Homo-oligomer: A and B are copies of this chain.
Amino acid sequence: MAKLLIMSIVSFCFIFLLLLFFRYILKRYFNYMLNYKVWYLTLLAGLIPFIPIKFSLFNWDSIDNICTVIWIVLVIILSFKFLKALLYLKYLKKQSLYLNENEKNKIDTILFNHQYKKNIVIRKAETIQSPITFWYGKYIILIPSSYFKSVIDKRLKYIILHEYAHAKNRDTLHLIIFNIFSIIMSYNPLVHIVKRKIIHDNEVEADRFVLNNINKNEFKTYAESIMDSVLNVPFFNKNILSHSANGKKSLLKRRLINIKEANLKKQSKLILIFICIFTFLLMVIQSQFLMGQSITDYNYKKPLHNDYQILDKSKIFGSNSGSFVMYSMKKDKYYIYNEKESRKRYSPNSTYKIYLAMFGLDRHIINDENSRMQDLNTAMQNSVNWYFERISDQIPKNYTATQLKQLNYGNKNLGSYKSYWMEDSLKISNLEQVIVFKNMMEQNNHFSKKAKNQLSSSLLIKKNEKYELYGKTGTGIVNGKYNNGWFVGYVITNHDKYYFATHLSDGKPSGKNAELISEKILKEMGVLNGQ
């Protein structure tokens, strides 16, 4: 279904635009114009994707779910508009009177001076405030009874001609048809656009006729007449299914009415003082509503409240440009390569699994005797997503959310995805990654010692006479390409404790390269080399 709606719109758009082009030049250079029927052509073009004819010469589900509901909604609504206008007119048909022979004479003169066909019907009523038409298979034409009396300024002459032109061209009907089609074609709002364009042009063609049948010195007053027919009426742009002088929802119209309504009034400044402040408070209330923290959309840029030194490790990053953060527990000092980049937030990928698993451990979901689903050491060493998918399913989401909040987990965005950190909604900077892991063991008072240590052992990479190096990689691979070269970890040495996070964005930003890069950096910096 949706593809048709979509492509129907496409069809329309294309055609429409082509036509408009012609419209553009016909008018611009020659004051010529498209025969409006082309808009049917347009419609038809809009309709024809339908042909179930094989002619030639990603979760998409919602696309159709939406298309289906939107459409049915539109049609009942638009149908309602239709029947109301229809009824108005049909009911009005009941109220439509025949003309006196000495009234009929004028109307007939206007049209049949050109021997126009008589397959139309002329009626009048006191219930007609302004010229209006209907169809009923008869092309019902209606004029104000007051206009039948007021046949002394010949506005009516002009009006009828205008109305006639609509009639010659069967405009009433064309519109009716279009509106009906528009209802089913409503998925394309442009049905109204074109409806409108048509109307505009219908009137233009009418104007052409008018001019075609009048003198050069009448052209002027006609234009004035267009104006009189709007100036002198409320702009009750009511008949959405026909024509009337006031049939347009716009500015001049609004303004003129306000003058009609000019019984001078004063709003207590308080009326608007209240509304404006209230609203402002309501806008403030929108601000109170999750103002969409640009801070959260933005990659982290808060100043590291902690000291620190800026590093230059560009030689090691080399072919895989990125950023890197290291921290000394003894000195409470950070060492940061490309701080602007270090502060950038990226989805954690598989490295988050350490948090997921350790949360399961603290909450007594996952344990040592029952670290299995593989065990935790195997699962972590081989990144077994299955193991971890179950762990998320087995941990109350609120436990996880609580920890995200308590220990400042980046943007703490849990998304809606059970594995939201896996190239999805949760994002964290390298700086934040270091801060959080360090605090996880050093400060977290809502997390057991066993969970801290059990997790730690599963991450050992290498060791020597100075230290034990722990960590975890992950690769942000999307649609087969590398985007996030993650490696995180910590070092326990015989003199200090260090925390760190590496992220590659350029070159081949794989988790493996991040591991290699981090180790090389940490060694050169003394972390893995005794300083």
A→B interface (CB under 8 Å): 1, 3-4, 7-8, 11, 14-15, 18-19, 22, 26, 30-35, 37-38, 41-42, 44-45, 48-59, 61, 199-200, 203-204, 207-208, 211-212, 216, 219-220, 222-224, 226-227, 230-231, 248, 250-252, 254-256, 258-265, 267, 271-272, 275-276, 279-280, 282-283, 286-288, 290-298, 301, 424, 478-479
Contact B291 A52 (CB under 8 A): no
The answer for the CA separation of A292 and B102 in the assembled complex, in Å, is 59
Q: How far is the CB of A187 from chain B (nearest CB, A)?
A: 14
Q: Provide the residues of chain B in CB contact with A262, threshold 8 Å.
A: 211, 216, 219
The answer for the CA separation of A42 and B283 in the assembled complex, in Å, is 8
Q: Which of B11, B298, B478 contacts A59 (CB 8 A)?
A: B478
The answer for the CA separation of A346 and B203 in the assembled complex, in Å, is 50
Contact B286 A7 (CB under 8 A): no
Contact B211 A30 (CB under 8 A): no
Closest 8 interchain pairs by CB? A32-B267, A52-B295, A7-B292, A223-B259, A45-B283, A49-B292, A52-B294, A57-B288
The answer for the CA separation of A48 and B283 in the assembled complex, in Å, is 10
The answer for the CA separation of A276 and B38 in the assembled complex, in Å, is 6
Q: Which of B61, B227, B275 contacts A231 (CB 8 A)?
A: B227
Contact B226 A258 (CB under 8 A): no
Contact B220 A50 (CB under 8 A): no
Q: How far is the CB of A29 from chain B (nearest CB, A)?
A: 11
Q: Give 9 A-B contacts (CB < 8 Å), ordered by A residue.
A: A1-B297, A31-B261, A38-B280, A52-B294, A54-B295, A61-B478, A204-B254, A204-B258, A224-B231
Q: Which of B33, B50, B264 contacts A267 (CB 8 A)?
A: B33
Q: Provide the residues of chain B in CB contact with A3, threshold 8 Å.
A: 292, 297
Q: Provide the residues of chain B in CB contact with A207, threshold 8 Å.
A: 255, 258-259
Contact B297 A15 (CB under 8 A): no
| Given contact pairs A223-B256, A255-B226, A51 touches B291 in the complex (Cβ within 8 A) | yes
Contact B267 A30 (CB under 8 A): yes
Contact A220 B297 (CB under 8 A): no
Q: Provide the residues of chain B in CB contact with A256, threshold 8 Å.
A: 223, 226-227
- Nearest chain B residue, comparing its CB with the CB of A282: B18
Q: Provide the residues of chain B in CB contact with A57, threshold 8 Å.
A: 288
Number of copies: 2
The answer for the CA separation of A316 and B393 in the assembled complex, in Å, is 35
Contact B200 A254 (CB under 8 A): yes
Contact A291 B252 (CB under 8 A): no
Q: Provide the residues of chain B in CB contact with A37, threshold 8 Å.
A: 276
Q: How far is the CB of A188 from chain B (nearest CB, A)?
A: 14
Q: Provide the residues of chain B in CB contact with A59, threshold 8 Å.
A: 58, 478-479
Q: Provide the residues of chain B in CB contact with A250, threshold 8 Å.
A: 248, 250-251
Q: Provide the residues of chain B in CB contact with A54, threshold 8 Å.
A: 293, 295-296
Contact B219 A259 (CB under 8 A): yes
| Given contact pairs A45-B283, A231-B227, A279-B22, A35 touches B258 in the complex (Cβ within 8 A) | no
Beyond the given pairs A15-B283, A250-B251, 8 more chain A to chain B contacts, judged by CB atoms under 8 angstroms and listed by A's residue number, are A4-B292, A4-B294, A22-B275, A38-B275, A51-B295, A58-B424, A211-B259, A227-B252
The answer for the CA separation of A252 and B252 in the assembled complex, in Å, is 9
| Given contact pairs A3-B292, A271-B26, A294-B51, A45 touches B252 in the complex (Cβ within 8 A) | no
The answer for the CA separation of A4 and B204 in the assembled complex, in Å, is 43
Q: Which of B52, B55, B275 contacts A298 (CB 8 A)?
A: B52
Q: Provide the residues of chain B in CB contact with A8, threshold 8 Å.
A: 292
Q: How far is the CB of A215 from chain B (nearest CB, A)?
A: 10
Q: Provide the residues of chain B in CB contact with A287, threshold 8 Å.
A: 45, 48, 55
Q: Provide the residues of chain B in CB contact with A33, threshold 8 Å.
A: 267, 272
Contact A41 B283 (CB under 8 A): yes
Contact B255 A204 (CB under 8 A): yes
Q: Which of B19, B51, B259 contacts A222 (CB 8 A)?
A: B259
Q: How far is the CB of A158 from chain B (nearest CB, A)?
A: 12
Q: Which of A248, A292, A293 has the most CB of B within 10 A?
A: A292
